[PDB]
Every structure is written in structure tokens, then in C-alpha cells.
Structure 1
Amino acid sequence: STGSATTTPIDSLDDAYITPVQIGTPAQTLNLDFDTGSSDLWVFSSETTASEVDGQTIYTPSKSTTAKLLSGATWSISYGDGSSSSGDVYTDTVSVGGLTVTGQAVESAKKVSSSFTEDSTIDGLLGLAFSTLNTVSPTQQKTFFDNAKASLDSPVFTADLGYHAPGTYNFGFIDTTAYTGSITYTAVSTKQGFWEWTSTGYAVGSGTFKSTSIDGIADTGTTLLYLPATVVSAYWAQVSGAKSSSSVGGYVFPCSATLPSFTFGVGSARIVIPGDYIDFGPISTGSSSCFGGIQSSAGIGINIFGDVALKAAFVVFNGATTPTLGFASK
């Protein structure tokens, strides 16, 4: 089997991407944030505290003839941005782009933190990291990809995120029309539950490439590119007037700037992030100070190849017995 679904930016900045997902019988379509940095499929629901729902579409398990309470199971998750959610668990039929999993754990939120409530466009998350990170207790549950893998034509999914435009998540096949050149594959460590890999270095603009190992995670659920402070300083030093602002919470730059590109290495190959991808717009409405899309990972404890980096590539998440990652230009 295969599946193919379009993923759409939630706003003009590409702050996140939403992908329609069918849950239950008859189908209830929710727009979920596909997140290769976590492993829970959770949704706003008829159980979510009413004051914490503000415009989201909810899953109502009582209206699904295939929903079954997973008795005794609870979940609770906290994300790197400080947001969180928790609740109980149903199993139900879940389909993405024509690919169907029966018996998928659908984690129903009883509580969500303010940032989820305040974002009316995201109805929940669909985790695509390794199932060892799934938070369901006392019986850990499998991700949608883990459940589907054996049925797929090939044990892979791909992320093709757009810059200010829709893109595609494919399951079970590699669309050879969706990228240029060849795909360069690179090793993955699953020891922390992430799609963790080692970039071979970087360049700023037209500058020379610096060969240096940068361990980090391919994380579709993180907006920005978070790298060591040395790398990030070298980038922003090429932008007149850019500075790190403790009050704003990262590097800012004059909105009048033209940003340089940023290149990262995948083995001997190179992925180029155009400068425009690194502009996240005014820090507050009408400000001439703009927020940078490359920020320091110092204090986060891991480097994060978020959407800013991934959207510059066609990315293969290879779930073969020994997982690997593939990157191609596009």
C-alpha cells in the first residue's frame, strides 16, 4: 500500500504545516501537525476542557462506530517549546492520503496548554519519530508509520515541505519526480528516539564550506533551524545590524536586509537554504526588527534541523531494519 497527502502552511510565515487525517467511522477529518520529532498521535476532542478549545475541529469518539476506549491508558506530553497536552486513549481507524491503519492509538486530549488553544488551525499532532518516545501509559503505543510499515510497498515516508506553498507527505514510495539529482543517504541513531543524524558541515552565502560534524535531528514539528552558537554567529555576522536579543529571545535583523543563503552538508552533498527561507518577519506587528530563522541550540541540548532546513530538500525517512535518512535537492 501507499498514501499521499498534501501538507499546507498554517500562515504566511510557514510557522507549521497541517495535513488532513481521517479518523473514525464515518470519517472525521482533522488537520494534524505531522511531527517527526515526537511519537504521539493526539487530537482535540469532545473530552477537551471546553475553555481550552477555540476554533479547532474536534474528534468525538462516541460518533465513531470503530472507536474503542483503550481501558486504563493515559498520556501526557511536553514539547521543546514548553507546550503540553494530556488525556486518555481510544483505538480507531486512521487514514492519511488513502493509507489506512486499523487499531491506531488516537490520544484524546482532556487538557491542552495555552499555545495549542491559541492556534485554531492545528487540531492535534501526528508523531513520526520512533515509537520508543510514545507517552501512553501503562502500555506504550505505536506511531501511525510503525503500524503501517509492514503493509507499505517500501518501509519509508517522505517529507516535501513547501516554502510559502503546499507540499506533500508520501508513505510507502519515493516520488522520483519530486526532486532533482540523486538522494544522498546518511546514518541515523535511534538511541534518543529521534531521526538523529550528523551533518558534514556548513557554508554561509557564497563562502567556503566548513567541514565539521553537526549532530542533530530531522524535526518537521519544529519551525526553525537550531545550530551551535558558533555556526549561528558566523551566519548572522554576514547581516548588517543583526544581533542576538535576550528580550526578544534570539537573533533579530533589520527587516530591510537581504539575507544570505545557508548550506548544510549531507555526506558529500549539499543542501542550500535560500536567504528568504530564513526571514520570519517582524518581531511584533509593524516592527522593522525581523526574527531570524536560524537560531542557537545552546541550552536546548540538541541541534534541530527544523522546517527551515527540511523545506529546502526532499527528505526520505527510511524505516528499514537499520533506519537511515535521505536528502535530495528539489
Structure 2
Amino acid sequence: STGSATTTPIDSLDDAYITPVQIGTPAQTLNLDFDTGSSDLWVFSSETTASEVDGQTIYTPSKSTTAKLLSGATWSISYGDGSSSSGDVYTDTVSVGGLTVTGQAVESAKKVSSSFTEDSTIDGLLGLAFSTLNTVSPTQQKTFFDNAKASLDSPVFTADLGYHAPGTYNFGFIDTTAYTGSITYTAVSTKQGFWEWTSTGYAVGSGTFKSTSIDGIADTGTTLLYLPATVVSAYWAQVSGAKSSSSVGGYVFPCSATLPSFTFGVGSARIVIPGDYIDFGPISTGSSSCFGGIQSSAGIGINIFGDVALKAAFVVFNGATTPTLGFASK
């Protein structure tokens, strides 16, 4: 089997991407944030505290003839940005882009943090990291990909995120028309539960490539590119007037600036992030200070190849017995 679904930016900055997912019978379609940095499929629901729902579409398990309470199971997750959610668990039929999994754990939110409430466009998350990170207790549950894997034509999914445009998540096949050149594959460590890999270096604009190992994760659920302070300083030093602002929470730059590209290495290959992908616009409406899309990871504990990086590539998440990542230009 295969599946193919369009993913759409939630706003004009590509802050996140939503993908329609069918849950239950008859189908309830919710728009979920596919997140290769986490491993829970959770949804706003009829069980969510009413004051914490503000415009989201909710899953109502009592209206699904295939829903079944997973007795005793609870979940609770905290994300790297400080947001969180928790609740109980149903199993139900879940379909993405024509690919159907029966018995998928659908984690129903009883509580969500304010950042989720305040984003009316995201009805939940669909985690695509390794199932060892799934938070369901006392019996950990499998991701949608893990459940689908055996049925797929090939045990892979691909992320093709758009810049200010829709893109595609495919399951079970590699669309050879969706990228240019060849795909360069690189080794993955699953020891932390992430799609963790080592970039071979970077360049700023037209500058020389610096060969250096940068360990990080491929994370579709993180907006920006978080890299070591040395790398980030070298980037922003090429932008007149750019500075790190403690009060804003990262590097900012004059909105009148033209940003240089940023290249990252994948083995001997190179992925180029155009400068315009690194502009996240005014820090507040009407401001002439703009927020940068490359930020230091020094306070995170891990480097994160988020959407800023991934949307410059066609990315293969190869879930074979020994997983690998593939990157191609497009």
C-alpha cells in the first residue's frame, strides 16, 4: 500500500504545516501537524476542557463506530517549546492520503497548554519519530508509520515541504519526479528516539564550505533551524545590523536586509537554503526588526534541522531495519 497527502502552511510565515487525517467511522477529518520529532498522535477532542478549545476541529470518539477506549491508558507530553498536552487513549481507524491503519492509538486530549488553544489551525499532532518516545502509559503505543510499515510497498515516508506553498507527505514510495539530481542517504542513530544524523558541514552565502560534523535531528514539527552558536554567529555576521536580542529571544535583523543563503552538507552533497527562507518577518506588527530563521541551539541540548532546512529538500525517512535519511535538492 501507499498514501499521499498534501500538507499546507498554517500561515504566511510557514510557522507549521497541517495535513488532513481521517479518524474513525464515519471519518472525522482533522488537520494535524506531522511531527518527525515526536511519537504521539494526539487530537483535540470532545473530552478537551471546553475553555481550552478555540476553533479547532475535535474528534468525538462516541460518534465513531470503530473507536474503542484503551482501558487504563493515559498520555502526557511536554514539547521542546514548553507546550504540553495530556489525556486518555482510544484505538480507531486512521487514514492519511488513502493509507489506512486499523487499531491506531488516538490520544484524546483532556488538557492542552495555551499555545495549542491559541492556534485554531492545528487540531493535533501526528508523531513520526521512533515509537520508543511514545508517552502512552502503562503500555507504550506505536506511531502511525510503525503500524503501517509492514503493509507499505517500501518502509519509508517522505517530506516535501513547500516554501510559502503546499507540499506533500508520501508513505510507502519515493516519487522520483519530486526532486532533482540524486538522493544522498546518511546514517541515522535511533538512540534518542529521533531521526538523528550528522551533517558534514556548512557554508554561508557564497563562502567556502566548512567541513565539520554537526549532529542533529530532522524535525518537521520545529519551525526553525537550530545550530551551534559558532555556526549561527558566522551566519548572522554576514547580515549588516543583525544581532542577538535577549529580550526578543534570538537573532533579529533589519527587515530591509537581503539575507544570504545557508548551505548544509549531507555526505558529499549540499542542500542550499535560500536567504528568503530565513526571514520570519517583523518581531511584532509594524516593526522594522525581523526574526531570523537560523537560531542558536546552545540552550536546547540538541541541534534541530527544522522546517527552514527541510523545506529546501526532498527528505526520505527510511524506516528499514537499519534506518537512514535521504536528502535531495528540488
SS state at 2:190 partner: coil
SS state at 2:115 partner: helix
1:326 deviates by 0.1
- The percentage of counterpart residues that share the same residue type is 100
1:299 deviates by 1.3
Q: Deviations over 1:248-288 (max 9, x none)?
A: 00000000000000000000000000000000000000000
Q: Deviations over 1:150-201 (max 9, x none)?
A: 0000000000000000000000000000000000000000000000000000
What is aligned with 2:34? 34
- Residues in 2 aligned to 1:175 and 1:257: alpha-carbon distance in whole angstroms: 37
- Residues in 1 aligned to 2:138 and 2:212: alpha-carbon distance in whole angstroms: 42
TM-score normalised per structure 1:
1.00
List alignment gaps of at least 5 residues for structure 1: none
- Residues in 2 aligned to 1:198 and 1:299: alpha-carbon distance in whole angstroms: 19
- Residues in 2 aligned to 1:241 and 1:182: alpha-carbon distance in whole angstroms: 38
Count of residue pairs the alignment pairs up: 330
What is aligned with 1:24? 24
- Residues in 2 aligned to 1:298 and 1:249: alpha-carbon distance in whole angstroms: 12
- Residues in 1 aligned to 2:278 and 2:182: alpha-carbon distance in whole angstroms: 25
- Residues in 1 aligned to 2:64 and 2:321: alpha-carbon distance in whole angstroms: 35
SS state at 2:25 partner: coil
What is aligned with 2:286? 286
- Residues in 2 aligned to 1:4 and 1:296: alpha-carbon distance in whole angstroms: 34
- Residues in 2 aligned to 1:128 and 1:110: alpha-carbon distance in whole angstroms: 22
Q: Deviations over 1:79-124 (max 9, x none)?
A: 0000000000000000000000000000000000000000000000
- Residues in 1 aligned to 2:155 and 2:142: alpha-carbon distance in whole angstroms: 15
What is aligned with 1:327? 327
Q: Deviations over 1:129-163 (max 9, x none)?
A: 00000000000000000000000000000000000
- Residues in 2 aligned to 1:114 and 1:253: alpha-carbon distance in whole angstroms: 28
- Residues in 2 aligned to 1:289 and 1:187: alpha-carbon distance in whole angstroms: 39
1:20 deviates by 0.1
1:246 deviates by 0.1
What is aligned with 2:240? 240
Q: Deviations over 1:225-265 (max 9, x none)?
A: 00000000000000000000000000000000000000000
SS state at 2:139 partner: coil
- Residues in 2 aligned to 1:187 and 1:72: alpha-carbon distance in whole angstroms: 38
SS state at 1:232 partner: helix
- Residues in 2 aligned to 1:7 and 1:304: alpha-carbon distance in whole angstroms: 20
SS state at 2:116 partner: helix
- Residues in 2 aligned to 1:258 and 1:163: alpha-carbon distance in whole angstroms: 17
TM-score normalised per structure 2:
1.00
SS state at 1:193 partner: coil
Q: Deviations over 1:17-75 (max 9, x none)?
A: 00000000000000000000000000000000000000000000000000000000000
- Residues in 2 aligned to 1:285 and 1:124: alpha-carbon distance in whole angstroms: 27
- Residues in 1 aligned to 2:182 and 2:290: alpha-carbon distance in whole angstroms: 35
List alignment gaps of at least 5 residues for structure 2: none
1:312 deviates by 0.1
Q: Deviations over 1:200-240 (max 9, x none)?
A: 00000000000000000000000000000000000000000
- Residues in 2 aligned to 1:15 and 1:179: alpha-carbon distance in whole angstroms: 23
- Residues in 2 aligned to 1:180 and 1:289: alpha-carbon distance in whole angstroms: 35
- Residues in 2 aligned to 1:225 and 1:6: alpha-carbon distance in whole angstroms: 23
- Residues in 2 aligned to 1:222 and 1:290: alpha-carbon distance in whole angstroms: 19
